[PDB]
Amino acid sequence: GRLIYTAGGYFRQSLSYLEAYNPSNGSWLRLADLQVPRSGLAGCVVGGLLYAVGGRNNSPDGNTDSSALDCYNPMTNQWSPCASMSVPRNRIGVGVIDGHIYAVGGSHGCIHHSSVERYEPERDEWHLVAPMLTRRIGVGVAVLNRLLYAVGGFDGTNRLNSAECYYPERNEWRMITPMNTIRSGAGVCVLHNCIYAAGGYDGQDQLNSVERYDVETETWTFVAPMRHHRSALGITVHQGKIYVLGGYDGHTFLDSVECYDPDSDTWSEVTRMTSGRSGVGVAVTMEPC
Numbered sequence: 001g002r003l004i005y006t007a008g009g010y011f012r013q014s015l016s017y018l019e020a021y022n023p024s025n026g027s028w029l030r031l032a033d034l035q036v037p038r039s040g041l042a043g044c045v046v047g048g049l050l051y052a053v054g055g056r057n058n059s060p061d062g063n064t065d066s067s068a069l070d071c072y073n074p075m076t077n078q079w080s081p082c083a084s085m086s087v088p089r090n091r092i093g094v095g096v097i098d099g100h101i102y103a104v105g106g107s108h109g110c111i112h113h114s115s116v117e118r119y120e121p122e123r124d125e126w127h128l129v130a131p132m133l134t135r136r137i138g139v140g141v142a143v144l145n146r147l148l149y150a151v152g153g154f155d156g157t158n159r160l161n162s163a164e165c166y167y168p169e170r171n172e173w174r175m176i177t178p179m180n181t182i183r184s185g186a187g188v189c190v191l192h193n194c195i196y197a198a199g200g201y202d203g204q205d206q207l208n209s210v211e212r213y214d215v216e217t218e219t220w221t222f223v224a225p226m227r228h229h230r231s232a233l234g235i236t237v238h239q240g241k242i243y244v245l246g247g248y249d250g251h252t253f254l255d256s257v258e259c260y261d262p263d264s265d266t267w268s269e270v271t272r273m274t275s276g277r278s279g280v281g282v283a284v285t286m287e288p289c
Ligand SMILES: CCN(CC)C(=O)c1cccc2c1-c1ccccc1C2=O
Pocket: 010, 138, 184, 185, 200, 201, 206, 231, 232, 248, 278
């Protein structure tokens, strides 16, 4: 599309911000808030509609994991509730295949989900599919050549370098090569033929290391690291470049927005969000109005 939308996030409490960045001119636009604050959600786009999936409302009033699915229409600048998932999913991962949305992992209280479910926008319905071989919260999810990939996370006791791949026509999950680094809460996306895992938390430190998985060779290789360590970051791809938004570096909730150009293997700073925050949902679609 044209704009990078960032929904929700966390700074001292869960947030309801929806803001859109325009890489063409550097400008941010504040849009309609989410009806319910939430961090740890995921964002995605189908048919020019933006979707906020899962998450958790951390608030003074209390803490409520979200099973919600809310759609935003850029034309109207309005949110509508969609059907809820079978179960709340905080620190969720999502991916889109064939106009269908896959919700992966996440926590509900102290439950750490291995379950997965699929939303069909034309019927406004969710259905459970095969569970991952591993429980994963704070899991990175990406789609490549119509296969779904779950990368890293936290299974309840250990944080994971493991990764697995879902094969829809077989309704089956299989392990792939693990990463070289343990990561939970990394930004995971797809560029060209590789799956990128950036940043995250390895149990001790927030990471700035970035690595990528080549589906042909089935290996992970590090690329240039980000200028900032960060976990619970937002990530997306726009015109051949990776954008990472916010996160937590162990000291500050970052407003930094970094851009990776794969041809030069460099990260440059590109803008600041209007305020520091972690755990945002991020997606890309056309301009509002
Ligand atoms: C994403 C993985 N984790 C925790 C789940 C951290 O990186 C982390 C580690 C130590 C302290 C803190 C965090 C963290 C993450 C997101 C928001 C706030 C904090 C925060 O105080």
